[PDB]
Amino acid sequence: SHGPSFIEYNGMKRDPLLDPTGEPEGHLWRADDNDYAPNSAHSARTNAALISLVRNEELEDLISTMKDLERTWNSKFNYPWIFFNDKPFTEEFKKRTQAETKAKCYYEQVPKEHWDPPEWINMELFRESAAILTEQKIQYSDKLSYHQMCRWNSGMFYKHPALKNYKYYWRVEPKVQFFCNVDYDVFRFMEDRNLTYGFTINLFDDPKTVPTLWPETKKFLAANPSYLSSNNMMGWLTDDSLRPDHTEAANGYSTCHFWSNFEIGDLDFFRGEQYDAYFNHLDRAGGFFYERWGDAPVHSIGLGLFADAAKVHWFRDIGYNHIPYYNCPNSPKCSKCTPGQFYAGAPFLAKEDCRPSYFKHVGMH
Ligand code: NA
Numbered sequence: 255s256h257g258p259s260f261i262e263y264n265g266m267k268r269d270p271l272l273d274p275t276g277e278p279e280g281h282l283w284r285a286d287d288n289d290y291a292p293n294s295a296h297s298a299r300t301n302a303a304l305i306s307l308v309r310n311e312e313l314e315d316l317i318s319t320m321k322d323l324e325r326t327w328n329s330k331f332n333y334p335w336i337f338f339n340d341k342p343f344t345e346e347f348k349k350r351t352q353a354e355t356k357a358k359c360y361y362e363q364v365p366k367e368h369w370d371p372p373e374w375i376n377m378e379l380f381r382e383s384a385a386i387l388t389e390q391k392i393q394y395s396d397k398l399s400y401h402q403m404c405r406w407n408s409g410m411f412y413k414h415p416a417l418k419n420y421k422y423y424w425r426v427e428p429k430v431q432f433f434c435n436v437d438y439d440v441f442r443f444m445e446d447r448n449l450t451y452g453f454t455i456n457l458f459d460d461p462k463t464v465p466t467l468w469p470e471t472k473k474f475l476a477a478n479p480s481y482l483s484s485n486n487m488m489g490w491l492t493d494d495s496l497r498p499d500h501t502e503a504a505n506g507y508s509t510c511h512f513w514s515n516f517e518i519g520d521l522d523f524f525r526g527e528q529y530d531a532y533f534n535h536l537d538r539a540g541g542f543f544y545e546r547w548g549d550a551p552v553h554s555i556g557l558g559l560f561a562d563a564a565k566v567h568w569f570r571d572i573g574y575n576h577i578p579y580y581n582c583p584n585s586p587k588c589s590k591c592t593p594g595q596f597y598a599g600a601p602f603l604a605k606e607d608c609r610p611s612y613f614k615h616v617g618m619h
């Protein structure tokens with residue numbers, strides 16, 4: 255039912271999002287039953303934050319996003335927002351953002367050591383490979399800052415001092431929509447079930463951004479044979495049954511990833527020995543700069559090799575859009591999205607959905 259449609263792969267045959275979509279099973283923490291007052295010192299909030307890497311120039315898009323997340327969820331639960339940027343935030347940014355929430359907002363700067371390329375990266379080699387990716391990649395002109403963002407999301411955000419006393423994060427990107435009321439504390443949902451990571455969308459990537467990522471991953475695994483988890487996603491990570499040319503071009507990796515612009519995650523997974531050693535291996539290999547290794551594939555591979563797959567959750571009930579893709583469930587809590595419509599735009603976008611592989615090899619839990 256949830257398997258692949260072919261005409262050539264052309265997306266999902268029957269999207270599970272069409273099924274009546276409700277809340278997860280088990281105990282759920284409700285706002286009407288608990289102290290979630292924004293300034294209460296004895297609230298039901300766990301140690302979690304909404305986080306966003308965002309520039310001053312993206313303020314208007316951020317405000318639209320905050321309005322959706324607040325209306326659908328955070329106006330009831332009042333978790334804090336923590337904003338990150340390599341430059342200082344303006345007073346206008348601070349005033350406008352804090353005006354959209356009753357929760358506390360924090361404004362943080364990424365340190366130089368978490369943003370500047372590391373010493374071992376040769377900037378001439380960077381510029382040469384960037385010129386080639388610029389020539390090859392569709393609707394793409396390279397910038398150093400894209401690579402710095404990917405590296406920051408991959409290995410640095412969870413080392414930031416501001417997050418030291420936090421265990422969970424919900425990553426939010428400046429220009430996104432949320433469509434569905436969510437009436438339970440998602441952070442404590444994760445905590446009570448010892449969940450590691452939550453996603454809404456699962457996509458193929460551009461193999462040109464990651465050609466040596468899987469080869470470098472295999473080198474890391476050969477050097478650290480005890481790191482591979484028992485409940486791993488090797489079948490999903492190495493699948494070639496939907497788009498075999500992607501898997502060939504990325505040298506053994508399907509390119510499939512959790513679409514990391516949305517994440518709800520356990521910071522302590524990424525801080526752990528296994529994932530962080532993986533990140534540092536990749537950091538030394540140089541592919542964050544000499545290629546364009548995305549934080550999405552890097553997170554997805556890390557989770558798929560080192561996490562328990564039973565602790566990774568599809569948040570099917572969180573209606574979500576980041577252009578051009580959607581997670582829109584069939585629920586009366588949602589509005590202004592079409593249930594089960596994966597994409598908006600030209601029909602060639604349909605094949606970018608990797609959930610039929612993820613659901614086969616890992617599951618829909
Ligand atoms: Na309450």
Ligand code: NA
Pocket residue numbers: 387388389390391392393394395
């Ligand atoms: Na290009």
